[PDB]
Design a binder for this molecule. Structure first.
Ligand SMILES: Nc1ncnc2c1ncn2[C@@H]1O[C@H](CSCC[C@H](N)C(=O)O)[C@@H](O)[C@H]1O
Ligand SMILES: Nc1ncnc2c1ncn2[C@@H]1O[C@H](CSCC[C@H](N)C(=O)O)[C@@H](O)[C@H]1O
Ligand SMILES: Nc1ncnc2c1ncn2[C@@H]1O[C@H](CSCC[C@H](N)C(=O)O)[C@@H](O)[C@H]1O
Ligand SMILES: Nc1ncnc2c1ncn2[C@@H]1O[C@H](CSCC[C@H](N)C(=O)O)[C@@H](O)[C@H]1O
Ligand SMILES: [Ca+2]
Ligand SMILES: [Ca+2]
Ligand SMILES: [Ca+2]
Ligand SMILES: [Ca+2]
Lengths: 339, 339, 339, 339
């Protein structure tokens, strides 16, 4: 009765305090604490001097983090040490969690969440009202913002890329086009896995240059054309396979139909389109739904079920051939042809 | 091996997503969803209309919350129901979690956390740099912020008031003064329990009048004077007992000493001071340390151990006599005499 | 005859070119190439940009290393990949070979070998002639040089430490002294394994502070005295056990006797000295003789046999009681008493 | 995996110790050990006295060298003996390996390698940075250095001279000019095989005189003019055939173009230029690339493919007429005419 109510109150309070737990991690990565603990334990004093932090306050922060499992408090000599949890925060372009922590550390990321109520009232991004500009405009104009986002997306993509290349038989295709392909890890993985294939990566001009760097340094520049462009205006015509991964979930129904219709126009009767995205099924995991809420906040996007995609595909002159599993999580490969 | 790293990564990712879980609760309380579920389940459609939310977006929010245990998703007819965790969020001035959730929903609250890095770099409140005004100034100028705060503090105080009145033998005291006594629940509980006692409450003018309401409404108006204003001016000489609850932890060391020295000069030789606040001991709970960090963010304050308070008292002409338990959290009553 | 001579000439020419093969590895490791290849093959161009190398020249270097089995030259698209031998060079504080390669990369290390002829003509170290200063003096003044030495030594001494602690029973000793104990890895392992024991670490002042940091971090600061000093002047008096590991092989016969004689006079009749070092016989492995030659080059030292040590100990008024195995290597423990 | 990693580590360590193995050979030839073992086995004691070495240390060196196959350690009575590998180290102006070993023994040769990293960072020779002077300048000013170099070059040249003379038809020519012809073995071999031919040898002054001695001794003094000169300045014009062997690989692209323009200017329209050098083709031998790296370290040069030479020749008004094999190895004769 009373004890049950008190337990519920404590459970909910832990949820509220969870916001501060996350922010403490953001500050630890922003300051570079985990990187400073790779060669044994260090004192709060020493960590404060190296990071430019206020000593007493960094000590409070580190005590708190250790209390919730991040870093170990050695309990003597003012020492703190790396542990299993703090270790996953080490900067690494291949780590989703490490890149995401640094992405989320940005004030404009946190501020979009400040205005979550706006998104819940509109179905639109809160990013604009919070930050005075859109997520796409910020990442277009601001190289630091672009870098934080592209790293966080890029780490996720590196993992998925190998999975896609292993889950779909591209052996029949001579040409592939990756629409909004980010830094190009998906195209790189598929090209590596299918030596006869050639590709084109289409991206926003600044991002396209980053993809050029990744693809060139991996020895793939002579097999992949880089196309700076806008997928609302341009889709290269007549390729065997088109790929679009974690793009459509950024866009509302109208904008998805715009994209799909332009893709449909570019497709040959024998062409295939692979929509590669998070699919909502009957019992989505909490994590899948958290990412759905992030899409809402940043760009007014949303995850969709296969039937929701199928409806939009129909309005675009396309139809689902089949859907294939792709590694762990909600990601699926939806193979699509012209109707 | 790599199975351990995977678990470490999921654990940290859950921490990051916890910020969003907190914000979803903030939005649910801002919109007033819990109070609409008191007469049986309701559809997301009806809840959205009642609250001014976008139907599909509120549905997403509620779906997410239910997957993490807050509200029940019935799984048919768009229905959601109250559950043990959501019931905790019902508007009720006696509920610490409900009032705190609604306080945290305010954009200036979340925005203080946006600039946590500033606090870690400086030892000073991030609230001021985030919001362009101090917490105290904001609660002076904006009656909505004032109300959110006074409710959040008043709910906690309601629980504490009876515990204090029962832990400390006030018999033999003729006069008591509560310094910054909020809405007066502490003063009310002590007066109830000790009919001989006459009281004086000091507070900023707006909440002083709120205290007058509470005390009057409880038939104690004749036994307690209300002195609105800065307590530095209003602190009466010659009272038998002075009380100060959840005030000193709002202030840095030097400001605490300023307050203590001011109280000392007002105390008769046989008077007692009760500092009632959260004490850090050798085994502080995570939730205790989270509140310490919140104090830094909002007002530049901090929680202290007994010996830390003892050092400040000894800069102020005061001495610890006894330290009494109060409830089952970190609250203690520190009984103090003039040196 | 003609063919056999040609084969002999090729074998010797391969030996000569082997010097350049070594240096090429030194440069690859100094530049950090192997680290850059952990995520798959990359172009010489991209590797050059990332390392600050001249593109054409790094390509030459990698192409050459690949022809002798270090890294793989993919033979297309300017790509190079990690292979079994290059992976050995990854920066790992636990790797003897990787840390040694970085140590040998130093110009002052290579320069000592420049004057090998001097050592063969005189029996003295070539390091001093070539570098204009001794190895000890350089590592005392140059913290960057000392750090390279530290990492190379540490990679092994950390494993040796646990081995000694498990191989000799210190259960009966109250006090131990590690003479020239490095950063204190040995002392730490022994103190961990023998809770009743107290220690003293004697080291050159700069190193003593390094040991302080290590032992403090291991929670042993209360159980081990740090003594900055010079073992040619000072040996702490009256300890139960003295340890001297990989020190004596740094010194010529007359210096060994000087050290041993100060140890003898500090010893109680029941004290024991443990000399822990490579004990050779009259037909060692090539690698062991290579290390003996390095001792000559760097510090004018040499590996010795038990008999040679015994001879020197007897000259110092010390007596070998017996010797013991530890580490399944050339490394043994010689247990010694006052004669 | 466990065994494989240890195998790799040992292999890499062996590569590292290979530098010391090479230096040990350098010392043995510098001291003149091999020439003392041609009349039977000798003790280290006798070898040390004969060579001015420290007895104990030479014994260390010889025992080490024998364990890796150079000299035989008889394993009794302190005796050592010549073996197949040490025999090729005997002083012989006609032996490439013996003369190269003694050239490499020089401290300034080894020191160029000390600064390999500089070359890899800049594309420039490390010799100058390491030795405070250029290779050409040192060999101009230091008669000992000049002799070591000229002997090492001259032994290789003796082996090649007969090959060139027998691989190209000099019948139609009346005059020949060897540009940077070293000690004249090439010119000598060509004059021998072609009685009607008259030669001019262009070399640095000190070198020119050594050429004079060789050609005089061969009875060709009246058939070959000796021309002290600088091929950046002076090329005798009007000769039928110009020869340039192992010179162009000493120079960078711009400097090769300078030399080529000089030669082009000097050639008659029906003249031929023979560039005789190591050619890089598909899948070059390791030893070929080792020499390429040595060129960089010593003089800032490089080995080239025929296509690379063709590019430079084209920039210089010259054209490849045909390429001919020359002996066994990477050496080829590139026959060239005016464009
Ligand atoms: N109008 C437009 N034209 C082309 N690309 C666009 C675009 N608007 C957004 N994008 C790109 O859409 C991408 C969505 S993030 C997904 C990136 C990549 N396919 C991956 O899976 O990792 C971003 O890289 C962004 O640059
Ligand atoms: N200068 C000042 N004079 C009077 N009151 C002040 C003050 N500065 C802050 N306060 C009051 O200090 C309080 C801190 S919150 C604690 C309130 C109350 N003692 C309780 O335990 O519930 C606020 O109500 C605020 O109004
Ligand atoms: N005169 C002197 N007095 C004290 N220590 C000295 C010294 N000269 C050299 N040393 C120390 O002798 C050590 C040799 S290396 C061996 C270190 C350690 N015992 C281990 O086994 O890893 C170095 O740490 C160096 O600092
Ligand atoms: N500026 C210059 N003028 C003339 N000769 C030069 C020169 N710079 C270097 N050399 C010569 O170029 C030669 C390169 S070594 C090759 C020598 C000879 N052709 C052979 O094959 O054996 C050296 O003998 C050196 O003396
Ligand atoms: Ca070979
Ligand atoms: Ca290719
Ligand atoms: Ca000596
Ligand atoms: Ca042996």
């Amino acid at each position: 009765g009373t004890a049950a109510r008190a337990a519920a109150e404590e459970t909910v309070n832990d949820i509220l305090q969870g916001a501060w737990k996350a922010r403490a991690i953001h500050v630890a990565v922003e300051l570079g604490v985990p990187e400073l603990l790779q060669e044994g334990p260090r004192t709060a004093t020493a960590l404060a001097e190296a990071t430019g932090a206020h000593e007493q306050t960094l000590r409070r922060l580190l005590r708190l983090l250790a209390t919730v499992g991040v870093f170990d408090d050695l309990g003597h000599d003012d020492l703190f040490a790396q542990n299993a949890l703090s270790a996953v925060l080490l900067p690494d372009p291949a780590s989703p969690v490490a890149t995401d922590a640094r992405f989320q550390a940005a004030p404009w990321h946190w501020r979009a969440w400040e205005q979550l109520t706006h998104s819940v009232r509109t179905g639109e991004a809160s990013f604009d009202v919070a930050n005075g500009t859109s997520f796409w405009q910020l990442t277009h104009e601001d190289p630091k913002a672009r870098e934080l986002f592209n790293r966080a997306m890029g780490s996720v993509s590196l993992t998925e890329a190998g999975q896609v290349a292993a889950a779909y038989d591209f052996s029949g295709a001579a040409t592939a086009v990756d629409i909004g392909g980010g830094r190009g890890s998906l195209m790189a993985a598929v090209l590596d896995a299918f030596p006869g294939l050639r590709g084109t990566l289409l991206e926003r001009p600044p991002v396209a240059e980053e993809a050029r760097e990744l693809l060139t340094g991996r020895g793939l520049a002579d097999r992949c054309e880089i196309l700076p462009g806008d997928f609302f205006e341009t889709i290269p015509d007549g390729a065997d396979v088109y790929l679009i991964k974690h793009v459509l979930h950024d866009w509302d129904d109208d904008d998805v139909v715009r994209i799909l219709r332009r893709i449909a126009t570019a497709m040959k009767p024998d062409s295939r389109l692979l929509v590669i995205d998070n699919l909502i099924d009957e019992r989505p995991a909490a994590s899948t739904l958290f990412v759905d809420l992030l899409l809402l906040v940043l760009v007014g996007g949303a995850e969709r079920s296969e039937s929701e995609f199928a409806a939009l595909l129909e309005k675009s002159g396309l139809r689902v051939e089949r859907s294939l599993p792709c590694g762990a999580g909600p990601v699926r490969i939806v193979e699509i042809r012209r109707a």
